[PDB]
């Protein structure tokens, strides 16, 4: 309860920093989320390892949206 | 849940909407106990019971 | 080349050039690269030429 | 003869600490984002051309709005004593703009409003006609 | 009497009212006045305030917190700390000879150009407020440094708060 | 020529004169008409006289007078200091200097235009100074009662007014700070209709 | 209703009519018409002579009028400044603009949850008195803060 | 007698950093939009200029959602003009919905031109009192 | 077990290690209650609980 | 709870500030600005006349220095020595370098938990005052140690 | 060059040496993984990683 009323008291800066509406594309479609990594090395067993310099991957696929999200479903 | 109002819903998503000639709105969406509405440039919360 | 204004008076103006050239000009005279000056505004830093170019303060 | 360092404040909260820890990285990401974007494309266009300033436009307006644009720009035109005009249809998805600014000029307000509108709508001002005008985007 | 807005940038007459209400005598009022006006008591009042003083050799320095003594993200003067400001002027009146250097310092977050602009504007409005009391303009020079050399550590929230400051140095000759 | 001192209600008119330096001392209506480029460093006028000079191409000069002359000066001269104690009127066309110090006590009507980086101005009473179209990087102004100042500061502005004083700036500096004690007033005095007017910034929103 | 507010927070109509009675006894013009409200203040009661400078004693009255202002619910607040005729039209318009700007930014520094605050000044263009003997002492030199209460 | 500090004072070391970061990220997004936005000069913006003839200075209240040619012909009838058409209607006719209570006729025609897109345009001759609608290829 | 730190692990041997753009490392390894690390040129021991 | 430590071992901040006060009243200069601490010692309190011989009575003072110093948590310490102009640059820099090296080695031998110790002397290049009346009695002959408090 | 995925760990235990032989002993304990070069004219200390694998 204390941390929730503190969260509500510090109100406008959350929506100030999380301006999700700018991220949306022209056709009102949610852009996807992309994962990054650098200097990865996996050892399969002894005498066999494999190292990549950087890697990238898709977390969730892009899809349509009707209204932008906010911080309330995340942090409350 | 289907809601008839005149303001604009913000938070929980909405499956479909319809607007009158007078600007009043009707929304169809999934059930939620609490909705977010920008009333007159100021945000506002609404509590739903009986779900 | 592109010139800039340096000092503005009713009647005369100061031109400073990209080559470092310095010039004092009347209300109307032939000027290099811009033709003929027809208007001097002392309220705002805007002088238009016969070539249509308007000189402003450099930034 | 005791010793004190200068900065004294109220006690803080660990949630606010974590908020700062997230915010510094987000700000760095947006800083390098804007830097790289400015590197990639050269700007060529300025909206001060298409909406120049005028007289009776220097009255100051401090504003925190958190909704759509239509009532806001109608209130602005009513304060500015100018006619207001609308072009195109409002789409089914409403356009929402959040603004929190401290008493600047109305032309700067309109330029920033059109900037945050972006590709959705455009703003034109005819001060000779004393008319502010919105126009929606024709797309889809 | 007195005007709370800096007494309209005038040399105040403070101890005369104290010795008048002491007589209402004069000698005990004057010795209490100079006990208050001892420079050690000035340093004690400045340390009651959040101002850090360092004496070293012929050079003396003062440290002023930007956040408490100034309006946030703005060169607007914080109006509350004017007793400390009057104490600052009273302490600075003792050295009418040497030149003074003034500097501003910030944290590590933001555009470096933005830090430079805010720090330089901060230093310029600080030295302007100082010049308004009657110092010679040729005796002054200001610099707003950015995050170039943090006297605290910007890894912690508390240290990043402790970083931003106003630093005033002056020599003897 | 090296020295000219005139007293006693005369008129000297000359054109196309070139000299490295000469010293001029004018008194009792020495009506001077000059149409040549003359370098000089000292010029003393007692006052109550007119002087037409078109063109002084000199490195440095110094002017100090106590009377009420009528002087209009052309050329490109760097100055060091200027003091006024009477009812002085002066106009100058171009000044290309580095640092100027102006003090006006009794009655001053001085119009200036040029590029000088550093300016210090002190006004006591009944002085109206016009550094309109005089672009300055650094400005430090102190005004007492019944004083009018017109400034054109570019980068750094320091303004101090006691009372009864008007401080009008015709350029938005990158740094502005000011203090008024009793009745001083600092105002923007601009046009509000300029097509290329620039507004405040975050650093420039110094609310008075 | 036990889990709902009975009234608006920090609201007392008796307090409101009390403080408007106090301000009318002081002399600040409080005008109520419909749901629109005007507050007119003389220029000498707040500022110094021909100058955008504030007396230190005025802050109690400014805090009181901010306390009255933060009671109601509003959207847009309009501030208009008016003066006498002193030097020139540009001088008077700039002075009124500066005074309105200062009082508006202090009012937004104080906690009243507006959405838009507009500030402007006109000088001596719209006097309200034929009797114009005074300068700042004249009652037509004034500042007006107005709004409409909306539900 | 007492100047008060602001109510929303950032009097905490976390809060000042939070507000400063918010200011910085708002500036970053604003500059992103500034470098991102593509606009047009108002010298060559393809919009219908106003011929401002006196028949267009009236007002009306019109609600409509459908085709274009019959609406323009009725507008020219109310303005006592003549109607001219060049080109052919497509397989699907152009549909424009206009709802208004008070306007200018020239404003109506300008918004018609705005909603027409590139497939059709209009021209007004105010000397020989006619309005023409032109199709594209 | 999957650990996340900007420090450097010494003792137990990890199956895989990856890094962020800020240098913060993540490790996949087997369960071990005591870790040996270097903090700033000094060796420390760390506790693992819930095993 | 009792397995994990509550504080850093052997640390009492009240004792730290009390011995700081006693050291400053003894005359050894203590400087605390931000996270950085600086200790200044006059050379006449340490050595003989331009010679790197340690006084027998100075070992108690050095013990007090080490006892205060091991209270903190540190990584790197730096000690520099300065003097007055006597013969050359070379002789003076050599004397300062030797004095700094021997005091750093004794401190590293003593029980202060650090990682890195840097030591250097600069002779008489950068003084703190223009009052050069004394020789080794002059306060520009000095030894400074510096560190930054970590975490 | 870039540091590899396996970090380079260096253990030094000495006392009262100058920085030149400190760097020399650092280089000798480094092995073939890295090399150290200096440019005292430009006041530059440079590390370089070995290009293996």
UniProtKB/TrEMBL annotation, chain A:
Gene that encodes it: dotC
Organism: Legionella pneumophila
Residue range from the parent sequence: 77 to 152 of 303
Name listed for the protein in its UniProt record: DotC
Source domain of life: Bacteria
UniProtKB/TrEMBL annotation, chain C:
Protein name: DotF
Organism: Legionella pneumophila
Underlying gene: dotF
First and last residues shown, out of full length: 208 to 266 of 269
UniProtKB/TrEMBL annotation, chains G, J:
Keywords on record: Membrane
Domain (OmpA-like): residue spans on this chain: 34-151
Gene Ontology cellular component list: membrane
UniProt key word Repeat: no
Official protein name in the record: LphA (DotK)
Organism: Legionella pneumophila
Lineage: Bacteria, Pseudomonadati, Pseudomonadota, Gammaproteobacteria, Legionellales
Shown residues in whole-protein numbering: 38 to 188 of 189
From TrEMBL, chain K:
Name assigned to this protein: DotD
Parent sequence residues shown: 110 to 162 of 163
């Amino acid at each position: 309860k204390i941390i929730d009323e503190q969260l509500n008291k510090q109100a406008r800066n959350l929506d100030a920093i999380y301006d999700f509406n700018s991220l949306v594309l022209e056709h009102n479609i949610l852009p996807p989320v992309l994962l990054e990594g650098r200097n990865t090395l996996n050892l399969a067993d002894a005498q066999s390892i494999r190292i990549s310099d950087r890697t990238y991957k898709v977390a969730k696929q892009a899809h349509f949206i009707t209204t932008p999200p906010t911080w309330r479903q995340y942090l409350w | 849940m289907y809601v008839r109002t005149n303001l604009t819903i913000l938070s929980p998503g909405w499956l479909a909407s319809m607007t009158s000639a007078d600007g009043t709105h009707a929304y169809e969406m999934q059930k939620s106990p609490v909705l977010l509405v920008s009333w007159h440039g100021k945000v506002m919360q609404l509590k739903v019971e009986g779900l | 080349i592109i010139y800039y204004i340096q000092a503005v008076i009713p009647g005369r103006a100061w031109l400073i050039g990209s080559n470092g050239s310095t010039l004092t000009v009347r209300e109307g005279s032939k000027i290099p690269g811009y033709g003929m000056v027809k208007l001097i505004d002392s309220l705002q830093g805007r002088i238009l030429t016969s070539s249509g170019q308007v000189i402003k303060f450099s930034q | 003869m005791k010793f004190k360092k200068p900065p004294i404040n109220n006690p803080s909260d660990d949630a606010t600490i974590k908020l700062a820890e997230a915010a510094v990285s987000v700000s760095d990401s947006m800083l390098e984002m804007a830097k790289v974007e400015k590197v990639i494309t050269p700007p060529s266009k300025d909206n001060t051309l298409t909406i120049p300033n005028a007289y009776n436009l220097q009255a100051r307006a401090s504003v925190d709005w958190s909704g759509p644009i239509e009532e806001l720009t109608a209130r602005i035109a009513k304060a500015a004593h100018f006619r207001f005009r609308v072009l195109g249809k409002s789409p089914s998805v409403p356009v929402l703009i959040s603004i929190s600014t401290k008493d600047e000029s109305l032309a700067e307000i309109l330029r920033d409003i059109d900037y945050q509108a972006g590709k959705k709508a455009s703003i034109h001002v005819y001060p000779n006609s004393q008319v502010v005008e919105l126009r929606y985007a024709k797309i889809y | 009497c007195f005007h709370p807005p800096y007494n309209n940038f005038q040399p105040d007459r403070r101890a005369v009212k104290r010795v008048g209400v002491d007589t209402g005598g004069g000698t005990v009022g004057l010795v209490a006045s100079i006990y208050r006006d001892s420079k050690r008591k000035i340093i004690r009042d400045l340390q009651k305030q959040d101002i850090q003083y360092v004496e070293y050799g012929d050079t003396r320095t003062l440290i002023i917190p930007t956040d408490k003594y100034f309006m946030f993200s703005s060169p607007r003067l914080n109006e509350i700390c004017y007793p400390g400001l009057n104490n600052v002027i009273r302490l600075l009146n003792f050295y009418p000879q040497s030149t003074i250097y003034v500097a501003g310092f910030t944290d590590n977050v933001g555009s470096r150009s933005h830090k430079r602009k805010l720090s330089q504007a901060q230093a310029e409005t600080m030295m302007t407020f100082l010049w308004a009391n009657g110092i010679a303009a040729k005796r002054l020079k200001a610099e707003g440094y950015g995050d170039k050399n943090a006297i605290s550590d910007n890894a912690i929230i508390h240290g990043s708060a402790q970083n931003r400051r106003i630093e005033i140095q002056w020599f003897t000759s | 020529l090296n020295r000219f001192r005139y007293e006693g209600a005369g008129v000297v008119t000359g054109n196309n004169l070139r000299t490295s330096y000469l010293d001029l001392y004018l008194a009792n209506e020495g009506t001077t008409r000059l149409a040549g480029n003359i370098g000089l460093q000292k010029l003393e006028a007692v006052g109550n006289g007119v002087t037409q000079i078109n063109g002084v191409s000199s490195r440095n000069l110094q002017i100090v007078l106590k009377g009420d002359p009528k002087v209009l000066i052309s050329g490109f001269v760097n100055l060091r200091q200027l003091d006024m104690y009477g009812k002085g009127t002066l106009s100058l066309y171009w000044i290309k200097s580095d640092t100027l110090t102006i003090r006006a006590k009794k009655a001053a009507k001085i119009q200036l235009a040029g590029i000088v980086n550093r300016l210090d101005v002190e006004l006591w009473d009944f002085a109206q100074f016009k550094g309109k179209y005089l672009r300055a990087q650094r400005s430090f102004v102190k005004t007492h009662d019944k004083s009018v100042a017109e400034i054109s500061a570019v980068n750094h502005q320091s303004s101090l007014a006691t009372d009864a004083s008007d401080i009008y700036y015709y350029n938005l500096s990158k740094t502005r700070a000011d203090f008024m004690a009793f009745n001083g007033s600092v105002l923007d005095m601009r046009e509000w209709g300029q097509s290329d007017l620039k507004d405040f910034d975050r650093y420039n929103k110094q609310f008075p | 209703v036990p889990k709902l507010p009975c009234r608006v927070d920090g609201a007392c109509d008796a307090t409101i009519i009390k403080m408007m009675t106090d301000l009318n006894k002081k002399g600040i013009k409080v005008a109520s018409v419909g749901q629109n409200y005007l507050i007119s203040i003389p220029a000498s009661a707040l500022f110094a002579d021909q100058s955008p400078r504030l007396n230190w004693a005025s802050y109690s009255l400014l805090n009181e009028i901010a306390a009255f202002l933060k009671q109601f619910r509003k959207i847009a607040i309009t501030v208009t400044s008016y003066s006498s005729k002193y030097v020139s039209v540009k001088r008077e318009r700039a002075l009124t603009l500066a005074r309105s700007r200062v009082v508006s930014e202090y009012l937004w520094s104080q906690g009243v949850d507006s959405r838009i605050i507009f500030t402007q000044g006109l000088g001596s263009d719209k006097p309200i008195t034929s009797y114009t003997l005074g300068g700042d002492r004249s009652p037509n030199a004034r500042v007006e803060i107005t709004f409409r209460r909306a539900v």
